[PDB]
Write a protein that binds this ligand. Structure first.
Ligand code: 4BL
Length: 145
């Protein structure tokens, strides 16, 4: 199984699924390294973020737990198709790359915060991470190239 993937047991259903401990992705289906990748992301910040401030909100006061709740909500909508990633990144992301549908352009190892870099290189083109934690807050990452 590709870098990071383990079989897990569904607690609700008792059906096996696959969890990726690097990207925090999970899916039912069995899963399937470049110099550069390209990604967008949706950042939800919280009170312990490196900079508890964004274009959306001058003083961010939400807790870590509330941020993770928001992130989970958006992952569910993206996954159900009720909303797409670019749209929720544009409206809700606490990064100013929100202006570019959450796009951050191409990058190699060595430029991004490490949990974000690892998650970004462990994704395949087209794939989305689960919640990725860095000192800026909680990310959903979409690998676009
Ligand atoms: C790893 C990583 C990469 C890009 C960004 C951009 C932000 C921000 O705008 O807060 N945080 C990051 C962390």
């Amino acid at each position: 199984l590709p870098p990071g993937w383990e079989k897990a047991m569904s607690r609700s259903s008792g059906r096996v699924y696959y969890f990726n401990h690097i990207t925090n992705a999970s899916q039912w289906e069995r899963p399937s390294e470049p110099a550069r990748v390209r990604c967008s992301h949706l950042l939800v910040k919280h009170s312990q973020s490196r900079r508890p401030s964004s274009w959306r909100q001058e003083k961010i006061t939400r807790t870590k737990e509330e941020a993770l709740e928001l992130i989970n909500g958006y992952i569910q909508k993206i996954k159900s198709g009720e909303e797409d990633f670019e749209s929720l990144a544009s409206q809700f992301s606490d990064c100013s790359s929100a202006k570019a549908r959450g796009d951050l352009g191409a990058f190699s190892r060595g430029q991004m915060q490490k949990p974000f870099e690892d998650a970004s290189f462990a994704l395949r083109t087209g794939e989305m991470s689960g919640p990725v934690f860095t000192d800026s807050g909680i990310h959903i990452i979409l690998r676009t190239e």
